[PDB]
Design a protein around this ligand. Sequence first.
Ligand code: CLA
Ligand code: CLA
Ligand code: CLA
Ligand code: CLA
Ligand SMILES: CC1=C(/C=C/C(C)=C/C=CC(/C)=C/C=C/C=C(C)/C=C/C=C(C)/C=C/C2=C(C)CCCC2(C)C)C(C)(C)CCC1
Ligand SMILES: CCCCCCCCCCCCO[C@H]1O[C@H](CO)[C@@H](O[C@H]2O[C@H](CO)[C@@H](O)[C@H](O)[C@H]2O)[C@H](O)[C@H]1O
Ligand SMILES: OC[C@H]1O[C@](CO)(O[C@H]2O[C@H](CO)[C@@H](O)[C@H](O)[C@H]2O)[C@@H](O)[C@@H]1O
Ligand code: SF4
Ligand code: SF4
Lengths: 30, 161, 69, 138, 81
Amino acid sequence: MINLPSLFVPLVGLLFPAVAMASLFLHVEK
Amino acid sequence: KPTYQVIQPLNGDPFIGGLETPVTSSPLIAWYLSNLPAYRTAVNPLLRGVEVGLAHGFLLVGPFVKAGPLRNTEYAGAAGSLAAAGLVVILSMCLTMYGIASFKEGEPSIAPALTLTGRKKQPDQLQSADGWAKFTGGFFFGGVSGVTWACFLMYVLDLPY
Amino acid sequence: DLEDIANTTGQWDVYGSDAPSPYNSLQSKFFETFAAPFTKRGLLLKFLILGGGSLLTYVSANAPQDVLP
Amino acid sequence: ELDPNTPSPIFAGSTGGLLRKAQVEEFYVITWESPKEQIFEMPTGGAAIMREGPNLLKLARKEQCLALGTRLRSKYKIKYQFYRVFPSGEVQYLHPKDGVYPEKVNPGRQGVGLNMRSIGKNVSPIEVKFTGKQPYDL
Amino acid sequence: MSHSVKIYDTCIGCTQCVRACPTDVLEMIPWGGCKAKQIASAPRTEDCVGCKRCESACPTDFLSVRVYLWHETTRSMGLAY
Ligand code: CLA
Ligand code: CLA
Ligand code: CLA
Ligand code: CLA
Ligand SMILES: CC1=C(/C=C/C(C)=C/C=CC(/C)=C/C=C/C=C(C)/C=C/C=C(C)/C=C/C2=C(C)CCCC2(C)C)C(C)(C)CCC1
Ligand SMILES: CCCCCCCCCCCCO[C@H]1O[C@H](CO)[C@@H](O[C@H]2O[C@H](CO)[C@@H](O)[C@H](O)[C@H]2O)[C@H](O)[C@H]1O
Ligand SMILES: OC[C@H]1O[C@](CO)(O[C@H]2O[C@H](CO)[C@@H](O)[C@H](O)[C@H]2O)[C@@H](O)[C@@H]1O
Ligand code: SF4
Ligand code: SF4
């Protein structure tokens, strides 16, 4: 296929954040 | 007729602020804003959803297709959608988990009309979660979609000059 | 008394809060369930935040022959 | 409002007092007497007049509506009077209750002043570890 | 505590001494002998904010109060709005 290891910066530095900024708006409510 | 309405600070009592001047309550403006969610809730939030989704939709194009990160695109997937069919999505649940600051759980259906409304204490809330859904659901199909007759429209353009 | 003009039509007046346009174009239930799944909203959003956001980023990052950083 | 227009404390406009959080929660309002038509100072920055009615201005929050005194008793009058309005009724009868003028004697009401032990040598720090069985909930 | 700052003293006389402080302090509650016989440290304190205007004047001879309340409503800070 050739040259493709780019997912562990969005799933982390991008999407993991989405989760918790969403999710953890559990501090406001759930 | 008078000096400027029957001359008044607010609707009435002057101990609430608002200081109703123009730019506040001139029949010149306050009518340019009430088929929509200004004074009165027309139909439910359902439909207003997409005129809101869509209008705000085909915006955010030349903003991120003419000011894009490496700009003036020669990629057939820009001058339109590209990514920004991301903003509407990063914010079409920037909303849903604000309608979790709305719950209040019902199902009346009163977008049909009865006796000349008021929705009365219509201020404060009095729009439950099963409302704020059908709006921010109108939002996605208004955002994503409103991004393509931007894109889809070729581009006949007026220029500098 | 000529300029006593009896307020050349009173109006009634105060129009209203009453009634200076009908309402919203008949375009509606031309979306009835059309686009549902936020009109089946009955438990969702967790679905559209793995799905939509694994396909604004799965293929969105990867690429078959760079055009690099 | 107007169809019922019951006013007393003249003003005209102002971006000062009362806004959203005095419906959705509590209310607070001051009332008074006066001799003959006199121009006052105001909380919220502005300034107007008097004469009578109830002489019943409504006020945002109660630190705001006693300052009619911290000047509005350097301008004659025994009587000035602020209560507590809700969005529905009572409990907290604010300048109501018994006697008035903070510095007389009918009853004693609350206060106390002591804790357990008095001001004396609390070089004694915090004692027991907080544990559900020894009189430290006061 | 939830409004617990001690201004007490020993005279608790309040003439050319201290009055200042939005609502909070409806005292004069004469304890059975303390000179100008009016005493203690407060009345019902669940009403107003967090001054130390509380001393500034008329003795506390020790400390003087300030903020210490933590548990802190809003009505207990201007801004709940
Ligand atoms: C930890 C994180 C991090 C990561 C991984 C990124 C990553 C990125 N940033 Mg970024 N950024 C960050 C932190 C980060 N940023 C921070 C902290 C800031 C503030 C300083 C910025 C400010 C910033 C700006 C101003 C920009 C970026 C841009 C970008 C993108 C550049 C290349 C690109 O076009 O994207 C690759 C992928 C996408 C953009 C999404 C792809 C979606 C496509 C594939 C969908 C189209 C097809 C169709 C419609 C969908 C089909 C759905 C179907 C299933 C129904 C890249 C995704 C730029 C950009 O994206 O402009 C183009 C530019 O806007 N960033
Ligand atoms: C010019 C720059 C500058 C810089 C370099 C910094 C740097 C810093 N500031 Mg800071 N700050 C600044 C200006 C700056 N500040 C200014 C001008 C102000 C106000 C005048 C502040 C007020 C401020 C406060 C109050 C604090 C800091 C803190 C910090 C530190 C926390 C770092 C961190 O990683 O948190 C990372 C930040 C986040 C994770 C929050 C951002 C959330 C965003 C991305 C969400 C976007 C919402 C989006 C639309 C919703 C999409 C939905 C999705 C989530 C599902 C860091 C030292 C904090 C500190 O002391 O910590 C030790 C904190 O106390 N700052
Ligand atoms: C982005 C905004 C910012 C914000 C949050 C505010 C907010 C406010 N302004 Mg304000 N203002 C702003 C920018 C802003 N202003 C600017 C840049 C100016 C020019 C100096 C003013 C001049 C101004 C005045 C004179 C007044 C206010 C007032 C107010 C307050 C109430 C008025 C109101 O909401 O009527 C509702 C507003 C509308 C219904 C706006 C409709 C206009 C739209 C349709 C324009 C569409 C543009 C059109 C397509 C072509 C124009 C192109 C381009 C040149 C813009 C409110 C706090 C009033 C006040 O002090 O409080 C009572 C007061 O009257 N403003
Ligand atoms: C505060 C701002 C400042 C401004 C003005 C800009 C502007 C820009 N940055 Mg940038 N940047 C900034 C700070 C700024 N940056 C900082 C502090 C950092 C480090 C933290 C960066 C890191 C960065 C990177 C890596 C990149 C940029 C890029 C860009 C460009 C693309 C923006 C884009 O497409 O978004 C989309 C824009 C919109 C959707 C705009 C819509 C709304 C706007 C018009 C505001 C609304 C006003 C509206 C008209 C109201 C008027 C009244 C109305 C009723 C008519 C643009 C030139 C990208 C670039 O490549 O530069 C050429 C690149 O990706 N920036
Ligand atoms: C109206 C409207 C709209 C919407 C809006 C909205 C709705 C918004 C929202 C927004 C949101 C909704 C946001 C959010 C954010 C978030 C955040 C900001 C979060 C976070 C975070 C963090 C960072 C955390 C931290 C922490 C915690 C808290 C816990 C503990 C500690 C720690 C550190 C962990 C728009 C504009 C679209 C347009 C249309 C109209
Ligand atoms: C995709 C199929 C759409 C066709 C409609 C059938 C199912 C609609 C999904 C809701 C599930 C309950 O089924 C329902 O459908 C009808 C709408 O057509 C309902 O009719 C109504 O139901 C709601 C109940 O508060 C009301 O807000 C609306 O007036 C209307 O939608 C009947 O109450 C019932 O039969
Ligand atoms: O690696 C990124 C590379 O792959 C893309 C992403 O859409 O798509 C390829 O997949 C189609 C499917 O048939 C192939 O025909 C062709 O290689 C591309 O369309 C392409 O954008 C990127 O270049
Ligand atoms: S010390 Fe202060 S308030 Fe305390 S008793 Fe005297 S003046 Fe009264
Ligand atoms: S010192 Fe405390 S109690 Fe006394 S007035 Fe100030 S805030 Fe109120």
